[PDB]
Structures are given as C-alpha cells and as structure tokens.
Design a protein that fits this description.
This is part of a larger assembly, with chains A (about 55 residues) and B (about 55 residues). Chain A is rod-shaped. Chain A contains 1 helix and no strands. Chain A starts with a helix and ends in a 14-residue tail after the last helix. Chain A has one helix at about 5-40. In chain B, a hairpin with a 6-residue loop joins β1 and β2. The longest helix of chain B has 4 residues, at about 50. The interface between A and B is small, with 6 and 9 residues. Chain B: Belongs to the AAA ATPase family. Chain B: This is 26S proteasome regulatory subunit 10B. Chain B: It is found in: Cytoplasm; Nucleus.
C-alpha cells in the first residue's frame, strides 16, 4: 500500500496545516476581542456616581 | 467635584466645558444639570441671618 498510504499521509497533513490557520486567525481575533471587552466594559466609569457606604 | 443635593446624596460631576474650574472651589454654590447632573452655573449665597442681623 506504499502508493496510497504515502498518498494520504500528505493529504491529512495538508488538511491539518489548513486547519491550523483557522485557530491562528482566531487567536489573532480574540485578543482584539478581549481588548474590546476590557475597554468597552471599563467604560463603566463615572456616570455621576453616588456616595454611599459598604457593610 | 462632589456636590450636595440639599435633601440628600452626594455625586460626581464635571463642568459644562469652560466653567472656570479654579472658580469652583469647595464652598461655592453651583447650578447642576437635570439629566447629566453636572455643574451648569455658579451662584452666590450663604446662611442664617443671626450673623447678618448683627
């Protein structure tokens, strides 16, 4: 089977090397998403905050 | 600035844009916004006329 095994190891390799690129792009994406999370949540700032007490 | 609602609570405000942030020393009276609640206009006054009537 040395014509078909050596055929398809290449095939599944090129498959997984394509499939790596998806997660490479998503890792590029989600750091931006986490920064948008950071600042666009931390706009929770002083909308005219009231003085109280903590118990 | 921390302002004083005369029935109650205390807030965090800003100016309009150019309300002279050196004029607004602790002790002045300001006019506060209705929605944004921030400072709109300074005022004079002060209190009990037992100082004044003498």
């Amino acid at each position: 089977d040395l014509y078909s095994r050596y055929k398809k190891l290449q095939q599944e390799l090129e498959f997984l090397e394509v499939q790596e690129e998806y997660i490479k792009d998503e890792q590029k994406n989600l750091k931006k998403e986490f920064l948008h999370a950071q600042e666009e949540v931390k706009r929770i700032q002083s909308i005219p905050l009231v003085i109280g007490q903590f118990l | 600035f921390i302002v004083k609602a005369t029935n109650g609570p205390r807030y965090v405000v800003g100016c309009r844009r150019q309300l002279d942030k050196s004029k607004l020393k602790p002790g002045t009276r300001v006019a506060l916004d209705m929605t944004t609640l921030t400072i709109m206009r300074y005022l004079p006054r002060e209190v009990d006329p037992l100082v004044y009537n003498m």
